[PDB]
Every structure is written in structure tokens, then in C-alpha cells.
Design an enzyme around this catalytic site. Sequence first.
Site, mmCIF file in Angstrom:
data_model
loop_
_atom_site.group_PDB
_atom_site.id
_atom_site.type_symbol
_atom_site.label_atom_id
_atom_site.label_comp_id
_atom_site.label_asym_id
_atom_site.label_seq_id
_atom_site.Cartn_x
_atom_site.Cartn_y
_atom_site.Cartn_z
ATOM 1 N N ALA A 97 36.660 89.046 77.221
ATOM 2 C CA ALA A 97 37.627 89.296 76.152
ATOM 3 C C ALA A 97 37.999 88.005 75.423
ATOM 4 O O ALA A 97 38.002 87.964 74.194
ATOM 5 C CB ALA A 97 38.876 89.967 76.711
ATOM 6 N N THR B 25 33.967 99.698 78.804
ATOM 7 C CA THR B 25 33.802 99.295 77.377
ATOM 8 C C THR B 25 32.648 100.036 76.717
ATOM 9 O O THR B 25 31.577 100.193 77.304
ATOM 10 C CB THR B 25 33.569 97.771 77.239
#
EC number: 3.4.25.1
Lengths: 240, 231, 195, 250, 212, 226, 117, 244, 204
Positions: E49, E1
Site C-alpha cells: 500500500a 485485492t
Amino acid sequence: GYDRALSIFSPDGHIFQVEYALEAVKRGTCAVGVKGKNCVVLGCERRSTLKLQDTRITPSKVSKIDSHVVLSFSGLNADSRILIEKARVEAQSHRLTLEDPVTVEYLTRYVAGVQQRYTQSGGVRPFGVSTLIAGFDPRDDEPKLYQTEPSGIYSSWSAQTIGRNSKTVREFLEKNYDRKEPPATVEECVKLTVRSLLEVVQTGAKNIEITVVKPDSDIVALSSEEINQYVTQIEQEKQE
Amino acid sequence: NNYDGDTVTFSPTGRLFQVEYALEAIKQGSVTVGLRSNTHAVLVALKRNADELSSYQKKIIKCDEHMGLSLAGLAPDARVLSNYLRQQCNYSSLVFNRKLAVERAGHLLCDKAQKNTQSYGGRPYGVGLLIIGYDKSGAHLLEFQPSGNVTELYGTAIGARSQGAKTYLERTLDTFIKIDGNPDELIKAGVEAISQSLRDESLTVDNLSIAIVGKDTPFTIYDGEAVAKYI
Amino acid sequence: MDIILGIRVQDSVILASSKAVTRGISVLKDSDDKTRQLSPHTLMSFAGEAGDTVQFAEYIQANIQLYSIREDYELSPQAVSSFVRQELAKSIRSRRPYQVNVLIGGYDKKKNKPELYQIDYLGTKVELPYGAHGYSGFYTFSLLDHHYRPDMTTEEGLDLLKLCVQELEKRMPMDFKGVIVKIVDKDGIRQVDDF
Amino acid sequence: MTDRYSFSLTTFSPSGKLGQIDYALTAVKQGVTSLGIKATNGVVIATEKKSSSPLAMSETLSKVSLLTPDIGAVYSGMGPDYRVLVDKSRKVAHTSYKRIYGEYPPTKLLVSEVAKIMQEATQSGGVRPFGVSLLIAGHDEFNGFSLYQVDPSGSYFPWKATAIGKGSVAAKTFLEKRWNDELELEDAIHIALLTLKESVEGEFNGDTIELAIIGDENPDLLGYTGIPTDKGPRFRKLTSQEINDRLEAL
Amino acid sequence: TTTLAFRFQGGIIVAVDSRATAGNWVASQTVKKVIEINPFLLGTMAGGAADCQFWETWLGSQCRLHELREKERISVAAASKILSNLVYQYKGAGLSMGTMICGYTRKEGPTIYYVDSDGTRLKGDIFCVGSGQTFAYGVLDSNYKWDLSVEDALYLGKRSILAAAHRDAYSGGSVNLYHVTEDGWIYHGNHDVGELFWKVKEEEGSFNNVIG
Amino acid sequence: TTIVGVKFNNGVVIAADTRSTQGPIVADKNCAKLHRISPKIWCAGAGTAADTEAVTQLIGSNIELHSLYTSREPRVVSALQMLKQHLFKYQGHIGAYLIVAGVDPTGSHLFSIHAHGSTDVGYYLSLGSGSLAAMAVLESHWKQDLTKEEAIKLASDAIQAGIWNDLGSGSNVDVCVMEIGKDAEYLRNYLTPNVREEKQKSYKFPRGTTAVLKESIVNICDIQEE
Amino acid sequence: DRGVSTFSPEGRLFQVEYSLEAIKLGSTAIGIATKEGVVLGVEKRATSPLLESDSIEKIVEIDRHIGCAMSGLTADARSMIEHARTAAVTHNLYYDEDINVESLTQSVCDLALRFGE
Amino acid sequence: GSRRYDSRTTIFSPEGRLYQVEYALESISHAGTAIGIMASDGIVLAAERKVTSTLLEQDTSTEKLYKLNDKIAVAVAGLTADAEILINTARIHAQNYLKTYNEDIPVEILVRRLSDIKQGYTQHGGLRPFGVSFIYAGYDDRYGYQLYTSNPSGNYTGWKAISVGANTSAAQTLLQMDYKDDMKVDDAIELALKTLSKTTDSSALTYDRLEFATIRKGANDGEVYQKIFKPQEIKDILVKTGIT
Amino acid sequence: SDPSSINGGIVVAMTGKDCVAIACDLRLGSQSLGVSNKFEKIFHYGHVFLGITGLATDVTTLNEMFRYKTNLYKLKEERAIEPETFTQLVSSSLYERRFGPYFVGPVVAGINSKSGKPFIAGFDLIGCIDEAKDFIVSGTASDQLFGMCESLYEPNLEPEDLFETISQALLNAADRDALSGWGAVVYIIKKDEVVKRYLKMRQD
Ligand SMILES: [Mg+2]
Ligand SMILES: [Mg+2]
């Protein structure tokens, strides 16, 4: 717990406990609010039935809710303390979570909400208090003045009065206050406020309190002598 | 009189006036009819409007694929009781993989209404209900009173002027019980039954409300132009 | 958070606090102000666990501001420090304690005296002429023990503070990105914008 | 169910009277006379054992009760109310004092706790006031000997000597003439027996009179030896024979 | 990420990669890591998430309630604090979140708050969060100016994510660009990293270490 | 700690040593381990000293209230039942190990109780770190139908075995004798076989030996009049 | 006195019928629905000329697609509006869509008979 | 059910008055008179015990004057049992504040707290109010010597001189006549006793019918002393001021 | 990690002829780091003296708690609390936190105002009372104090002789403990006079 419905409807659609709370407000000492072009003035009546009073320590009629907002009232003194404490706590809570002090309208809406809640909750009676809430919104120079009552309804006013003989001083304000041109200075606004109370008060001695609120947290209470000078000038113009 | 201040007080003749006053609210309500054969069960309801600009208040509520009711009286109380029936029908399906028997549904409604007639602070329900359904023992029709009394019937009616429809069904008993495998004729009999309770007004397209449940028919409600065929 | 230092001189209290905020691998910020004004003449600096530091400081600030409005009066530095100690002493036996260490620098307007209080996350309070939290004292106290005088001026206090920061920048392994310095005296709280 | 009486049953009337408290005091007035006298070296409390039936064993009904080893209590008014208050008083002496300080409460503070319980039955929801007045006698190291009266309102007052119940007005006048600050305990017992005889109609002997003293420590009633500082209870209930012996010198 | 946000003359640039991994396995290349809180507020996804998706949508609901009640756009300060106070309540329970709350109001101007699951709330000009954060910081720090044009700022954000996508194994897929103005955010497309890398290599002359 | 209980003809006797320790250090050399639950019900405690004292005083308090409520002298079985149900509820976290003995209208009794809440009956019992030394003496000299004098002798001998052989025990022997139809007699320091010998030297200092920085009077009195 | 949840001999709840009388004393509000939109209008009715009339708030937004006008004891409407706004926003959170106007109305009406002792 | 027996202690009258508060004030008007007078160098508290007896143990008796802490005392008018409930709560509040801030509680903060407790019983709970009026005499370093009163409504006010209980109308007029701002404690002692002597319903004012207290900085140097007068000391000050 | 030795410090108390003495060091630290040399560990409520060693936050908390409780005691009892009674109050207060205790070692010292009898007592962190005739010790150098007191102490010492004995007991015990020292205070307590003396000692 005590759950009894004290505030209920009557056959004619009235809630008498709320209406009787207004009668307690009618008994309270007179309070008045007047907003100028760049200020708001709160005037309060002190009944002279009580002398030998220690004025240093006796609870004052105008209370700071925050550095920029003030609250005055008419009605039960003990009841007003509960609303003042709640408002002060909410003011700090708002600063903590929103990172901005309350607007005058928000603080009014909160106090009014508490008052309404006490008209349809079990085991409680309504507050015998009406309030005048005045100040300036953060980073704003437009004067703000609101009124609340036991039922919980609230509204904004160019000028307003509550308490005993408030019918008389409202009469005065309605013919003396011009909306197109509000009191342009602090002097003019304080003068119009002292004038309005002199319609009702008695002696202009220790019976009139005056608090001036200006923008940017500028709040000051006038002393006996300062108010006495307004009282003197008003009657010397009246002798004509 | 001195004994009608609350539901926790018997009168000297052993009556419960608050319950009787709740029963009175049903009599003020609009008429609704229930009837059944051996294959189908039907609800017919006359809906009431406030005025000519207003809608017609809905009378029939679905509780499950195999069960539903019609109401007469306080509509919010019907919503509370029908919600409870939806939950109980649902509990039976989720926990036991079993469609809730109509008779057991009646027992549950009785007990829920009873608790509000024996305790201080509360009030009785102000609505009457006609429950139809099709379960493992065939078609059923139930009548609920907020006193707690639930009764299984071939046909009935509740609300204002319901006595006319009830007498008609009592005459026609031997005919409409035999209407098997013909949904349209059973509804016709119900529409003819509710007509015996009308005065001044007649059955229009936004006035009439019909529901049906049966052997191979999920509980469905008909309103609007879907009931013009029966007018 | 890292370095927080305090020194009480003749007429003021000086608090110095590092500017770095490090989340593990990267230095996310180099201008962070690890302090809250509790009242016009009382300042609190803080260091400890992420999140809990600012949450505790703002909670204390809200409470002191509430007291100030209710009574129309500023609590003494001693009274504020006692309130803060109790909150931390309460917190240490909670489900999840505040892991926050503080210094409270205040000027008492009644006694006309500066005051510095050091309180750790357990609720351990001491009044000191100079103080620190973490490893800051290990590097600076020998310098303060030598040079400190109770009659020092504010300027002399700042100079002794510079010597302390220089020793920290020399011997400490972590880059704390300098310090923000604030002075508390009879006139209130001000920030030294060049240090 | 649930207790749905969460509101006060004692309230102010237009004249400022608390009706239920006044009515409780009326119940006390109908009660059998009890008295207390304080001497220089002790205190005496006494009452009549008004037996409801001669088939009843009146020794099984205790009107004079030990609260602590150095504190005793007597009453006038409703007997059952007194009995439960004695239970509550005995417990509160432990829970709010002895389990904290490792010693029994001084007389004035135990009186204060009993008074609080009686006050709460005058304001709390769904209850009536207690229909008794109490006389509590006791000794403690720093206050010496003392005697207190507690009323249904929860109010309490210290006395040199007093009486409550049926013939209290006459008894208090009798006590005013006889009491002085130089009385020995035996003199106070003698005066107690003289005073109590006036309000008693029928039999007057050790079996119909209940009398107890707060006086010297009784090491013979301690139940154990070996600890010098423990010297025994100061509360002692006089026997039927001990009362009759003093009725010959009457 | 890899996620970043920076303040500049023309507002805020938000840039993110698109890759989600479970260990070494690449679960998705098409993940939406910018959460559109409302037409004026953006949040970035890093850490958990679900925690980011769930609580930043929830934040949108709280912001909508605020403006209904107060008849005024919520400040970035107030919006970010609602989220940070919420996650602070859950501290210890195991929430995972590292996000930038981005907005542009009248009273504040362009504003970014870094909000984090251990309770941290930091106002700042440049933030970068994720496994590839250090690579993006390098490109940002050496090329950032306040007086960047909207065109150049958009490219800088795109180029910084590309740098991370190249070096960080757990960053890649595609680049999503956003420009936050006072009148709301504007979406500036999805850019496949595969195609973008070759395009940037040729036009810029960078990545000489890689054969093309 | 060494504690024993011994039944005899017309009652029961309990005894204990007088050493309390913190690890290897002797905190108090003349500790009182014999506690009173009620006038004629006494107990001795081993384990966590605060727990043995606290549980004794709590049940002793409730026993006194129970005695007043029922107008009856307290029973040993009541103390036992209340102790065990309190201890069981806390699942051994209250570290009280007790020997409970006494006389009541039912007769004379002797019980042991462990921290988890189990109880036992016996004619002779021992508890504490010196219990094995004490039990060795009890198993060697105990017989049925002991006299008062014989039981006191046996109990104190059993404590002495703990004193001399167990490092956890020492100093003096305390005894309490509970006989039917008599006052319980507590015999504090019944034996004193461990008096310290005179020291070789006096360690009294000359006056002015200690260096002093400041002197000041401490105001212990309340705010004064006038 | 008498229960707050008491039925009259006609089968009506006393308190509900009495609240309807309070609404009759309220300022007028009107709504008209068309195929091009719905219009809502109110009478403000200020008690004095010194009262700033734009602070009188008798028309209120519940959501972007739902508005509301009130008549009667207007202080009582505040918690009803709060509930309506919360219900509209909550449904959007749970279902990623606008709530139906009827469903919103039904949710507000569920509060109505929740009174008693 | 139970509603039938509910007096509804927390309702307004048609005139906007609280029934129970008004009736509690009526009760207090029959209690023994208590007076407080504030001087520049201290405060005086004087109060009359209600019709006593010769067999009452006076030297151990307390019904009027109570210590809240070392700096604050109260005079009571009304139900003594009700007062002791509130007094104990006030004592706890003072200690809570001292523990929290490590400073003695300011007088007004203690007064406001007790007054708020009284207020609550008038608005919620359905219980009867406390039939008590207090005079608070206290000192702190912000406002110095202070006098307050509170009543069953929970309303409180500050005073230079004030009376509660019986004959307050007559007492207040006498105080208003002779009080001056530059007055001293010894003068205030005389005024308080003279006012009670004139307003009393008894035949004569004697030592056994009085409770007396002073709060003086007549404590050696920069501190404050509370003096609850003994029976012999009340007898002496009665002779000194020429009342007996 | 061990809460009772994070901050360090010691208290000792002794009895003499018609007198008692109680003494303490002045150090507060964070393990190895010396933080304060003015942290007094002896407090008094009327004529009853209380020394507390252990975790410093709990030392401060308990002082505030016992000031709280002895102030309420005095208002209700109308007299100052005695050493014997206060000892029971400390024990009760500590045991009420049985499963979440204050990490402290309290010591009580005083003379009963009515009997004139000298009194001392000690406690463990959960309330167990040690009532010794001779001396009581507490803190991170309690072993050292036990050694000093056992050899230096003799009964019936006059006030000025008892001062020398207790001072030398404290000083030499503290000098063998890393976490104790940095100054010391000795209280000499007689029935109606109390003298407080700060001692000169090494500052390492
Ligand atoms: Mg050392
Ligand atoms: Mg060293």
C-alpha cells in the site's frame, strides 16, 4: 581539485572569459543555416590554406547528433567534439527514458545548458564554440534551426550565420530572405545558402560544404560536383 | 593596502582588513536597538525600504520560543547565522531537554564566525546581530560582531547613527533596568532610544519593528498596526 | 521468459521467440515481442528474469545506437556479440547480476554471411548454425541435428522451425502462446506475420 | 590547510621554454661530475665523493646506488632529490614489474619508470621538477649491457659512453677519443679513472672516488647456494683498495 | 485485492475493490486503491500500500516537472517508464508493487502499462492484478469488445470486481469506478458491494447459487 | 605436507617433503616447499599453497626494499612481524601456516606462524598434516647443543616419519641449512627414497595408430616482410 | 589577483556589485500587482530580424500560481528556474499544498551567495 | 593564499586564443622535423633526430617513431617524455577496444581519444598542456591507409602528406609540389628523404641522424606489416635514393 | 551449481626431446546439454601456448585478458614473452582475485626461444604453480588423465612419438567423462614449427 574561478565579473559588469570565447568563434571558419518550407540547409566554409589534406578521413564540419538532428559549429575544433559527444549521449538517453527522440529545441536547450555551466563552474574555461543545430521534430514537417553561443543563450532563427565574416553573410541573408515566402524547394534553399557563402569564401571549389536535412531522418551531404554546378549557375546569372 | 586581498593575511601592525571591511557593512545598515530589565528584554528596529513601492526589509528573526535576534548589515548572512542558532537551540532541546542558555548561544556564534577569519578561500560574515532572550538566569542581551567578538550588555545599538541611541541608554541605565513587570514602559524606553538615531524620517506604522521576550512572554514580533500604540 | 530459438541458413538468420508473459497464476499477455533491434542488420532476442530482460536489452540497444551515430558505421555481428558478452561477464560478479540469456542474429554486410551467436547470463558465448536457451534445445536439437544443411533456403529454414515449434507444443507442459518469427538478411530485419 | 596548489608550477613561456625544467638543468650543471662507459663484457659508472667536511664520514653517503641486482645508478645535481628517486625507483621495480612477472625489470623499462616519475613532477599540481640527471647502467638477458641518461624533463637516451654535471663537455670529448667497440671491462675502468682525474681538484684515491661496475655474475655475493639458475648479482661496487690497485697501473 | 483496467472505444475503464487485510483481519473496507496521479493519469494499488501510494504520488510530481520543463503533456509511455526505472533501482531491496498506469493522450490514444516491482513494464489492452484477479479475468474475457459503450464498459468493470469480491475472501467492501478520457478522468462513484450484490442478483438473474 | 625446523649449535635447519595434493590425488610428485624470503631467511609452508607462496613473495619483496632502505641485512623478527600483521588483518582467510627460520646479525632464529596471525618460538617445530608423525621423532631424539650433522639427520628423519606414515606427505626430502657466518645451503632432493620401479611393459605406440581428420601448420611467426 | 568573496572598503562584495552592472545592460522587465492579479511584461530585444522572436523566452512559469520574468545574463536564469520549479513541486510532494510565494522566492535567493573558491 | 602563484593555464586571451596552447606550439617548432606520406600501397614515416653524438647508441635508441599496435604507428615532435605518457595511454586504449569488440581499433577512434585527452588539459584542471604534436600512420579495413596529425589544442585533421616540428612551412610547400595521388611507397620513400634533405638545419643528411618506418601491405597476401628501419637499412636506402 | 563443472572439458600438456605438446577436447555444455563441439580451449600469445579449463565465461575472459597483457608486454619489452615469464603473469593475475576468483584450471606450454628448453606448468584457480618435468593435467576428467599419463608417459619421446602418447592419453580419459569429448585438438610444438592436428573420436 583545481577550483579557481576563471569566469568572473569585471567592474563594468562583463565576464571577459565568456567574451573572449566569442572571439575564438569569430576566428573559426564560417557556418550558415537556412530553413526552407520543407527543409533546412547547413553550409560550411573550408579554408584552402590546407591542401595535401585527405578529405575522406579529415573530421567533417557537420555532425549527426541523431538520425534526425545535425550540428555544425564555428570556433575551437577540439572544444566542439566535447559538446558533440555530450549531445549524442543525451540523445540516446532521451530515447531510452522518454521512448521518443529529442526535439530540436530540447537538444539545443541541453547543449546551451552545458555551455552556461562552464561559465560559472570553478576550475574550467568556457567553450570557444557557437553552434547551429538543425533538424525536424519526430513526426513533424516544420523545419527547425537554432543557435547557441559560449554564454549559453539560445534562440530560433529563420536563417543565421556564425564565424569569420558572418557579419557580411548575415547582411546578405537579411535582404535576400523573405519570411512570408521561404525557399519553397531544396534547390532554392541550397542555392540561397551557396550564394550566401560566395559573399565570403574565395574559390567555389573544395571550400564550400553543403548538407541538406529533410523530414523523417532524410540527411545527405552534397558532393564537390553537385555543389560545383550551383557555383557555375550562380555566376552565369551574375554576368548580366 | 597590500594586506587586504584575503582574510588569511595580517597587516604589519597586526590588523585584519577583510574583517574590518566586513565591520563596515554593519555601519551602512539601518539602526536597531536592544535593551532589558530584570523581567523582560526588548528589541527595536528601524526597517529600511528600497522606495515608496517597496516593502520595508525585515530586521528581527525568531530563533526559539525564548530567544531571537535583530540584524544590521548583509541580510543573507543573518539568515545563515540565525539558521545555525535555530539548529543549536533545537539540538539542545531535542538531545538534552534543555533550553539553550543565551550566553552559550553567544559562544557558538563567536566560534562559527572565527573559522571564516583564519582560513583561505572563505570570507568573514558581513552582519551584526543583537540577541535577546530569557533563560534560567533571567533576561539577557548580547551584541555580535563578525570579528567573532560577542558581548553581554544591559543595552546597546548597532547600524547607522547608532551612537545617539547608545548614549541615551547610557544615561537612562538606572531607570530602564528597574522597569520590571511593565512591558509597555520598557518598549517606550526602547522607542525613545531609537528616536535619538533618526534624522529627516520619523517612526511610522510600516517603519517600526519591535520584539519582546520575558518571564511569561514568548519571543514575539510586532509589526504594522500593532506598533501604532507606541508611535 | 521462455522459448527462444535461432537458426542460421544460407543467406539469413531466423529468430523465433514465444509470445506469453506469465506472472505466477495468470497469463497477463499473449502478444509480447521478446526482441530488440540493435542495428539495421542485427537483432537480439532475450529470456530470463522479469524486468532485467527488457532493462538489459534496451541498455544494449542504446549503446549500439550510440556507437552507430558516433562513427557513422554499423558494427559487425561479431563485434556486437563480443560487447554483449563482456557486459554479461562483468554483470555476473556484480552486487545483483543481470539474469538474462540472449541470442544475437546478424547479417555481416562485409563478409556477406549470416551469423548466429548464443550467449547466456554468465557471458558464455558460442557461434552456432542453430541455438536455443532454457529447455528449448532439449526438445528441438535432435530435429535440427537431423535435417539441418548449411545450404538451406530461408523457406526451408522456416519449415524446419515449424517442425521444432510443433514438437515444443506437443511435449512442453507450459502454454507459451505461439512464437513471433523474425528474419535477418542483407536487406535488414522483417517479421513473418503469419506463423 | 589542504594542498591548495592544484595548478601547474611549470608552464610554457612565450618563447616555448619550460622555465622550471631549464632551471633544473642549470642545477645539474653545477653538480659534481659523474660518468659512464660501456664495454663489450660490462659497464662502469663513476663519480667523485665531494665530502662537505673532513669530519663527515663520506662512506655513509652513497652516490652510486644499487637499484636491482643487475642495475645501478649515479647522478649529478641535488643529492636529496636523487636519494628519494632511488627509493621510488627501487619500489617501482617491484610494484610494477617483479610482483607481476617474477623477475627484475630490464634496464630500459626501469629507466622508463623513473623517467615517468620525473615527467610528472614537471606537469602535476603544486610541485617543482627534480634537480638531477641520472646515469643508469645495467644488464638483462635479451638486451645485454646498456647505459642510459635521464634528465629533469623525463627524457632519456642510451649511450656508449657519456658524462654529466660540472665538467661534462670536456669529459665527453675525452671519451670520444678513447672509446671503441672492442673494449674489455678493465679497459673501460682504466678510461673511466683517466677521464675522472681531469675534473677532480684535490685528493684522487679510493676514498674520494666512488666506482661501480655491471659485469659478470657474482655467486660469492648471492648469500646462498643450491639453485643452479641463480648465479648472483652483476652489480658490484669496487672497494677503496681495488680502485687504488688500478691507480698504480694508471 | 482486485484491480483492473481495460482499453476500449471510449477510452479506459478502471475498477477496484476497497478491502485491506492483515492476515484474516479486515483492517479497512474504505481503502482508496485508485491513485489520482494527476487530472489525466490514474494508477492502481496492489502489493504494498505504501510503496504504491508513495511512489505514484512521487510520479505525479515528476510528471508535473516534465510538463513545466517541456511545455507539453507527458506521454503514458514516458510516465510509466519513470516509475519502472525507479523501482528497478530498488530491485532486491523488497519493494512490493503491481500497478496499471492509465492515460489517454493525442499521440498514443488510450494506453495502459502494467508496472511491477521486479522491473516489468508491459503495454496491453486488459490487465487484472490482485488476489481476486482470476475471477475478474473470466468476466472480462467473455464480455469484452472494443466497441463497448461507455455505459456498458463501466458496468462490465463494476461486474468483474463484484465477481472477485464474491469469491475472493480478501476482496470486497465497495467498488470504485473511473472513466479515463482524453480530457481527463471522470469519477463514477463508490458502490457498496453488499447492496450491489443483491441489486445485480435480482436485475441480472445471476448468482442463483446464493439465496436472497 | 610435513615440514620441520630444528635449531643447532651455530644455526638452524629447515626441511620438507615434496608431495602436493588435490584431495586424494597427487598433483606434483616433486614439489618445492622450501621458499626463500631473503638469502639467509627461508620458510616452509603448509595449508593453501597459493597463499603460502604469495605471502612469502610479498613479505620477501618488502623485506628486500627494507634491507635496501636501511642498508642492513634483513632480520627474521622483521619477516615475522610483517607476516603476522598481514595475516591477522585478513582474519585467517589467507590460509598460510609457516615455519620461518634464518640467520642475521642478531643470531639464528626459528619461529612458527598460523593463519590467524599468532606466532611462537621454539628449538624444534613441525607443521602440516604429517606434523604429529614428525613431532614424535623430534620429541624422541632432540637434545640441547646439537651439531650441524646431527640436526640435518634429525630434521630429515622427522620428514621421513611424515613421508612413510602420513598420506598427505611423500616422495623426497628437501633441506636448507642456515649457519651463522656462512652462505645458506639449499639441498634440493637431499634424500630420494621413492623412485618408481621399471614398468613391466613399454607403451610406445606404432606410428599411425591415432585417427586424424585434418593437419595444418600453425603460424607462430609475426607478419612477414615483402 | 584577489578573492572572489572579497569585501570592498565600503563593506560591499565586489562580485555582487559587478553583477548588478550586468543586469543594468539587460532588457527591461516590468511587474504590477493589483487586487485582481499581477501583470508581468518584458522587452524581447531580438538582435536581428532573421531571429524568430517567439523563441525568446524571458517570461517563465514556475508553478500554476507563480510566474517569473528575467533581466540580464538570461542563460544564468535557467538553473535558477530549474531550482524554483523543483522547490515548488517538492513542497507540494511533502505537504500536499501550494508553496507560499515568499517561501519560493526565499529558496531561490538562498542560491545567490553560494559562490567562491 | 595559493591563488597568488597560479599562472591560470586554461584561460582565453582578449583575442580568443589559448596562451599555453600557442606557447606549446612554439616549443614544437624547434623539435626535429617529422614527415608522413600516404601512398596507394602504403605509408611512409620519416623523422630527424636532434643534433646527435658519435657516442649515442643508435641501434637501441628511439625518440621519434613509436609503435601503438601492429597496425598503427606515430611520429613525435616535441617533448619526448610528454609523448611517452600519451603513447602508453593510446596503447592501453587500443587494447581496451580489442578486448571489448574483438576487432582492432579503427585509426580515427584512437586519434580522437588521444586528442580529447589533450583538449581536457586546455579547459580544466589548471595544469600545463602536453608539448607534443603527433603524426599518426595507420591502416584499418574501413578507410584503408590513413594519416592524421594532432597538436596540444586537441585538434586533429587528416592528410595525404604532412609535416610537424621544425621548418613545416618549407616542408609542406615541397610536399605539395611533388606529391601525386597515384604515387607508390617506393616513390614516397624518396620524396620524404628528399624533403628532409632540403629542409634540415644540419650540413648533410646521414643515417645516424634519421629514424625511418613504412607501413605496407607488402606483407605476404591480405595483411599489413610495420617496418621500423635499422641503422644499416637507413644507410642503404640513402644510397639507393642517391642522397649519400 | 559447482562453477568448475558446469561447462566441462579437459586440457593436457607433455614434454619430449626438444619439443612440447598441449591438447584439449572441444565440448562446451550446459550441464547435461551439449551446446558446442567447436569450443577450443588452447590459445597462443607468440610462441607461448595457454590451455584453460573450467567455467567457459572465465575461459574467454582470461584469454582476452592475457592477449591484452601480452600485447602491452611486447610493445614495451620489444620482444615476445617467454613461457617462464608468462607463467608468473598468470599466477599473479589469478591471485589478485583471491576472494572472488576465476573458476579455471590453466595450463602453460612452450619452448624458451633462447635456451631451447621445453617448458610446461599448471595452476589452481587462485594461482599456485605446478611446474612438472613430465606432464600437466586439468579439467573435469583430471583423475582419468593422471591415470593415463602416469602409465603411458616416458621421457625424451621424439615429436611424432609424443603425438601418439598425448593423443591416446586425452582420448581415453575423455571417453570416461560425461562432460568431455565432442572432438579434440593436439598441438606439437618445436622451436620453430608448430603442427595442429584434429583427432577423430566418438561423438557421444
Ligand atoms: Mg566423453
Ligand atoms: Mg552422450
